[PDB]
Structure formats: structure tokens, C-alpha cells
DNA sequence: ATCTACGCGTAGATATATCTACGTTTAACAGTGGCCTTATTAAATGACTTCTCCATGATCTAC
């Protein structure tokens, strides 16, 4: 996640400095929950980034 | 793994939103005619207390 999805999701940060963090900084584990499979904004951007990465 | 901070789920309190709809009979009448019983009978029979129980004085008779 922080290797590839984070730089495309987190727009303005140092990617190497992003490589040494916790998943919640970009996923938002305060919410998290199986609700990521729903229609939430982070789900939207994650799906967009995944679809762009693998075309 | 543990301490600490913070964002979120949630429950309680509150203001809001709910399209059709309207017009819902106006008129004139609410029987005009004639009758509202004609006959006849207005009981026919017999019965209308039944009975005692009397009041008073002269006379007979027993003690």
C-alpha cells in the first residue's frame, strides 16, 4: 500500500518517507471496518488508483 | 505492549415535509273530480219470597 497506492492517493508527501508509516495514515483506520467495501470516498480513490495501476 | 490523544458511532432532541382542485345543478310543479253506504231488525219467556222466630193476659197447677 505505501509502496504504490499511497503516492497516487496521498498527493503531496515524500514517498520514501511514506514507506515507513502505519496503514491508517492513508486508509483511515478510525473508520476502517468492512465498510471499505462500500461506497465511501477513500474506497472511491482506492478503486481509481488500483484500476489505474493495473489498467 | 502500553500510555495518551482524538475522531467517530450513536443516541437524544428538534424542525420540517407531506403538490393538485373545483364546480358539486341551475327551474317549475308536489293532483286536478266525484262519492264517504244504500235496507232492516233495536229480542224473542218465565220466574219478582221461599220458613220461624208473636205479645199479653187469663187460667191451670204445684208448693
Automatic annotation (TrEMBL):
UniProt name for this protein: Uncharacterized protein
Residues of the full protein shown: 56 to 110 of 329
Amino acid at each position: 500500500v505505501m509502496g504504490e497506492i499511497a503516492p497516487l492517493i496521498l498527493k503531496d508527501e515524500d514517498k520514501s518517507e511514506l514507506l515507513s508509516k502505519n496503514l491508517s495514515h492513508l486508509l483511515g483506520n478510525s473508520d476502517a471496518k468492512p465498510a471499505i467495501n462500500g461506497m465511501r470516498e477513500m474506497t472511491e480513490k482506492l478503486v481509481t488508483v488500483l484500476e489505474e495501476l493495473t489498467m
